[PDB]
Write a protein that binds this DNA or RNA. Structure first.
Lengths: 90, 76, 74, 88, 88, 90, 74, 76
DNA sequence: CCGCTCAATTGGTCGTAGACAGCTCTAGCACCGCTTAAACGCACGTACGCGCTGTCCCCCGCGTTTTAACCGCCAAGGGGATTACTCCCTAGTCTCCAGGCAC
DNA sequence: GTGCCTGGAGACTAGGGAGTAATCCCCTTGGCGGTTAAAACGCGGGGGACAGCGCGTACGTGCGTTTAAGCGGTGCTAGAGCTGTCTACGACCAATTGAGCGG
């Protein structure tokens, strides 16, 4: 499996299959979905690393959308990515 | 009517915005800004619904209309 | 939310009537519009309060909303 | 769609902290958005150079373009040290 | 690319007034931009509905989305009264 | 010829050929380019109609980029389309 | 143009050096950057003058550029 | 250096912007705004050049970098 | 002013992509009662816009006098753009194997 | 706990699309040298930030009232997804003309 071979947590084959159903080009590459799954894996393991750091900087057990809204608009690490986003909280 | 956007709801939006004191003429200006914002977003949501041959404005048509203004909305 | 839901639904259903008559809205489309409108108005009053502090005032005035919308490009 | 892998990365980054059901839809719309943004930027970069194949180089450039600064440097470093670990 | 037709429409709208050589490049970048914007909006609208064929209806919707107000009403009216004159 | 048949001034076949080299879909439609050439024809015959209306008072013979920059940011008819544009004038 | 061309080319070739060393620029890339930078600065001083009039002043101050850039989102 | 953006060139940009009088501290702030604008656009122009396997930043890389900020530039 | 060449036009194919006919069955709309929270109408008592008023300080206009921008030359080479291969990478089986499922 | 079924990674073959040279050669950089405009310096003064001072309002708060929004509960049917056919389809070749150029 290319996901374990690339040592990732996201499925490369699903990112490639989502690039196929989007018809973003005529033909993909061999290692393009491994790179894209490793970047999206990095962004998820950077946002949820901070949501899990902020939940224990508090007594909460799960991760609520209030934690995502409080982290992503603070935390100048990824606050530039969410200048124009709104977590719905409903 | 636009009069449903009441005086204390605009006051609560300004208190969350950090405003300490509000003049007595903000209330009709804020309704005129909210009506322009809704006339700009609902036009695009109705355009996506008429393009999708539907009669029900779903929440993804609203997410696409807010995406066409640089106001991406997560959670729908 | 800070705006009452039923007058905001009346507002959306009286604004959208000018675009296509006899439309229906999902129950989550109106909450997405209400969430986006309060997230717009708070972000507008955060720059109006900056324009009111900039004039050495505390009370916000309609010229502060007009400046915060002309600088923003509205 | 992508919700089954968000919990799988969360088990690695925080095996003790759980996640809600609305926050999973928020992270799933976040992932489908940064996916349809990176792939869209890489399709415009495959059109500007008159290519036909999206390689990993158009993904590395769309990551440099979309993500600002240190997030672009770490996403490029993670994609590079995942493609090299893939080919080996 | 599109510079040969800008002068051809200008001969209809103003047969007496000429145009410069930098203004032709400006109108040609304007046309290639509003083309690659309308076609891009119609490809996103063909993806949001999971279609495969860009019809004239995705162009009419991308014109309603991109152009604000009266410019959208006149561009839709001109495209409609050009497709109907085409089919006849 | 479909351009004369549609009574246009832009070539429909070139708009269709530019939709093909952009690969915006898998298959176009019958009126996929006649409609697009009539809308771009309308926008050109609305901008140059105003540039030729404004040159009349000005007295100039040709059309310079200063006329385009003066018209498109005034003239609320199409000033909304050019909120974020800059004519280079060089 | 309003900025002198040779110091603006020195500025672009000393800013771009931090991104990739030993780059070359076309003669029209520098004029596109200079045209875009003055079209940025005039559009910035048009909102700075609005922020200076808003405080009942004529002289623009650095807090007017800072307000016109914080409202704009910079 | 950034010091090439002289005092009277910023004064000419403010006179074209409609400013009547300029404080003595605008000059170093305007250079700090211009340097941020160039550091945001030249980064994308160098990204398009390194993606195109070139060493010469053409004017279309600058047009694409300004297009990625909502600042479309006609004439190149 | 005519002969010759050519990408635009326009016949069959096979569309399958979309149209469309029908089915259900959410669900979104519609209505009534009804708490009660939220808004609403005054009083008023301020905190606070707001004009004005005087020290005052610092920015603009105005010679000066520099400085390097700019223009004009040439010299060099380098890295663009084009072409010609060209080779090798990715588009379709299978298969062999994991991983999800019963008792 | 392991029989049994689903899917996706390794062979396995055809490729056209980047790779790689290789070639003008354009242009871009690199200088030198020379006008001369533009900036830089300093001066001065008066225009305008500006802090203080009243001083007259209009907002928050409160204190009453009073309206409707939520809510909770029925009807209901509409049209949103469906699914399942059911046909025009744009794609291809091909067979004619009008514009560009030669004589």
């Amino acid at each position: 499996s290319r996901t374990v071979r690339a040592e990732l947590s996201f499925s490369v084959s699903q990112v490639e299959r989502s690039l196929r159903e989007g018809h973003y080009a005529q033909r993909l590459s061999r290692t393009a979905p491994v790179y894209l799954a490793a970047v999206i894996e990095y962004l998820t393991a950077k946002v949820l690393e901070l949501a899990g750091n902020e939940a224990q900087n508090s007594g909460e057990r799960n991760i609520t959308p209030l934690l995502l809204d409080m982290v992503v608009h603070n935390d100048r690490l990824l606050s530039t990515l969410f200048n124009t986003t709104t977590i719905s909280q409903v | 009517n636009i009069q449903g956007i009441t005086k204390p709801a605009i006051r609560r939006l300004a208190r969350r915005g950090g405003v300490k004191r509000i003049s007595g003429l903000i209330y009709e200006e804020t309704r005129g800004v909210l009506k322009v914002f809704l006339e700009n977003v609902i036009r695009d949501a109705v355009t996506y619904t008429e393009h999708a041959k539907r009669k029900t404005v779903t929440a993804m048509d609203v997410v696409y209309a807010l995406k066409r203004q640089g106001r991406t909305l997560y959670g729908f | 939310l800070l705006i009452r839901k039923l007058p905001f639904q009346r507002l959306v259903r009286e604004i959208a009537q000018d675009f296509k008559t006899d439309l229906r809205f999902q129950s989550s489309a109106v909450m997405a519009l209400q969430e986006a409108c309060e997230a717009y108005l708070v972000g507008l009053f955060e720059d109006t309060n900056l324009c009111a502090i900039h004039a050495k005032r505390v009370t916000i005035m309609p010229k502060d909303i007009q400046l915060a919308r002309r600088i923003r490009g509205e | 769609s992508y919700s089954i892998y968000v919990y799988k990365v969360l088990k690695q980054v925080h095996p003790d902290t759980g996640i809600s059901s609305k926050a999973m839809g928020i992270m799933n719309s976040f992932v489908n958005d940064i996916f349809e943004r990176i792939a869209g930027e890489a399709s415009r970069l495959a059109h500007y150079n008159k290519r036909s194949t999206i390689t990993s180089r158009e993904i590395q450039t769309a990551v440099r373009l979309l993500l600002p600064g240190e997030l672009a440097k770490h996403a490029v470093s993670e994609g590079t040290k995942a493609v090299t670990k893939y080919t080996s």
